[model samples]
Target: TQFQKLMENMRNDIASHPPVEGSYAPRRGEFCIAKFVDGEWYRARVEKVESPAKIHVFYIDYGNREVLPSTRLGTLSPAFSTRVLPAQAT
Candidate 1:
């Protein structure tokens, strides 16, 4: 339940100040907030930029990788960048 609480806190904070459309640029090794297919935004790291609009991201807490559209990624909030949970091993 601790992880769920962490996710909920993140979602609440980010939802209060959602990123603007087209406001983010995905660069390798940068931290981000990625929207999962289930529509929850989770902490992520930019592993690679597959194309102009496709990015390869690793969900930090969940240890899953996916190539997602740029639209699904957002700039990470500075306050939330502190790693609350250890990165999940792949």
Candidate 2:
């Protein structure tokens, strides 16, 4: 079916470009950043890797956590503390 083909393509695409070794793909206890309601991205650490494509991260300054897609997380960047939608550093 169409759904199966779509999934197969997605799997192939992901397999072709795996995250670089040591890259910030959200490992347990690894530091990272995420966007919050205040229009800023803040420091966070990897609380958990929910799956190959999802992660649960804990905010550093806010003292809370959230489950966001892996794509939502970004490498530590100075701009994230003030700027929104900054360029990907990783």
Candidate 3:
């Protein structure tokens, strides 16, 4: 059926772009960037590497934090530096 075909396509689309292979694996106190749930990018610092795929970050601008997948993070250019705090409960 058409609905089944559409769902299959959706699944395949997701599979085609597999999560990045820890391209920006963050460690405690490291700088990184992440796309917030609101679809905006922000500068953040790593507070913890919860697992191979998850990281806890402290958003610099908003002074808030979250745990996100390592794939969602990217390297922060070395041209600038800032302080980051610990993560808070969601």
Candidate 4:
């Protein structure tokens, strides 16, 4: 029972702060650990969940300031590189 409650709370908390597209539970305003298709993790944060599903945007803002100015374009197509973490949930 206690475990269930804890889990539920975690889930709810996660709802307000969903993980990166391929990961889970990223702190809202901080760069978080997120995974990518290439089996890498990036320092990301929940920028916003624009359409709930169709447009879930994530941003990696730790030392990636050089790209921060254009991440919106970067995430859209893939013409740019990323500072990704080495693994999932990293």
| RMSD (CA, Å), each prediction | 1.8, 13.0, 12.2, 13.7
The lDDT-based order of candidates, best leading, equals: 1, 3, 2, 4
Tens-place lDDT per residue, model 3, 48-68, is 887966788888656888898
Best prediction by TM-score: 1
* lDDT over C-alpha atoms for residue 72 of model 2: 61
Per-model TM against the reference? 0.86, 0.53, 0.62, 0.29
Residue 3, candidate 2: alpha-carbon lDDT: 32
Score residue 47 of candidate 4 by CA lDDT.
Answer: 59
Candidate 3's displacement at residue 89, Å, is 17
Model 3 spans > 4 angstroms off: 1-21, 83-90
lDDT of 1 by residue, 30-75 (tens): 9999999998899899999989678999998888898999999999
Question: Per-residue alpha-carbon lDDT of model 4 for 1-90, expressed as tens digits?
Answer: 433343355345544555434433323344434434443334344554444332233534333321121122212112112322221221
**TM-score, cand. 4 vs. native:** 0.29
Ten contiguous residues with the weakest lDDT in model 3: 80-89
The 10 consecutive residues of candidate 4 with the worst lDDT sum are 71-80
Q: In model 2, what lDDT does residue 58 have?
A: 77
- Candidate 2 segments exceeding 4 Å error: 1-23, 37-39, 78-90
lDDT values, one for every candidate = 0.85, 0.58, 0.63, 0.35
